Amino acid sequence: QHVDAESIMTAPKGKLFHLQFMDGLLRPEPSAFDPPASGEDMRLIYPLQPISVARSMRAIVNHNEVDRPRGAVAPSSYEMDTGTLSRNGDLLYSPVANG
Amino acid sequence: QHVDAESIMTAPKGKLFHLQFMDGLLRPEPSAFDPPASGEDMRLIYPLQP
Amino acid sequence: FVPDVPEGYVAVQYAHRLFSSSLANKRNRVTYTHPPTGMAYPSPTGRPH
Numbered sequence: 061q062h063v064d065a066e067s068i069m070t071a072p073k074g075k076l077f078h079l080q081f082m083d084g085l086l087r088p089e090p091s092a093f094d095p096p097a098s099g100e101d102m103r104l105i106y107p108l109q110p111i112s113v114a115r116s117m118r119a120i121v122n123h124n125e126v127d128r129p130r131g132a133v134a135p136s137s138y139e140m141d142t143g144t145l146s147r148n149g150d151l152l153y154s155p156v157a158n159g
Numbered sequence: 160q161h162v163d164a165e166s167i168m169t170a171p172k173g174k175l176f177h178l179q180f181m182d183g184l185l186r187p188e189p190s191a192f193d194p195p196a197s198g199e200d201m202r203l204i205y206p207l208q209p
Numbered sequence: 210f211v212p213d214v215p216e217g218y219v220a221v222q223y224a225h226r227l228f229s230s231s232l233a234n235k236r237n238r239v240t241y242t243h244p245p246t247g248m249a250y251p252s253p254t255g256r257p258h
Contacts, residue, residue, distance in 0.1 A: 089188075123192060124232045
């Protein structure tokens with residue numbers, strides 16, 4: 061999809077737009093000897109806030125050179141602390157230190 | 160084409176073999192995230208001269 | 210018969226951390242990094258005993 065700047069500057073307030081963004085991390089590298097292509101990709105519209113707020117993980121792949129790909133995101137430790145049911149019925153994470 | 164080592168060690172002298180060699184200079188680089196393939200390429204026969 | 214391990218060998222516990230993808234002559238080979246020397250060997254050939 062593409063959002064025209066025209067509609068962005070001319071929609072009534074309360075229209076809910078749906079912008080799309082590429083994560084370029086996993087984009088293929090060009091072959092070393094392949095001729096340059098003409099053209100330049102461009103982006104006119106941008107967020108004012110971080111967009112990937114729901115992101116748990118990213119780039120679950122190996123890189124053949126570096127120990128981990130840049131921008132790779134491990135899951136938070138909290139996703140995996142099963143913790144304990146408490147006597148109340150309240151859930152708890154595991155104690156961080158004894159006592 | 161491929162030249163079996165058997166024929167190389169067992170042809171009568173004066174047989175003219177036709178070996179082939181890859182120039183690997185222009186070989187494509189693998190994608191950075193693509194999984195390793197199993198296997199190892201090998202070469203048993205070599206020249207003694209350029 | 211259980212063949213004895215030869216004099217030059219180094220004991221090494223298997224671990225998923227030892228093996229990895231790597232570049233080596235334009236191929237994504239399954240490199241093994243020897244825990245003592247730390248050296249990476251992409252090829253099954255030529256690795257330390």
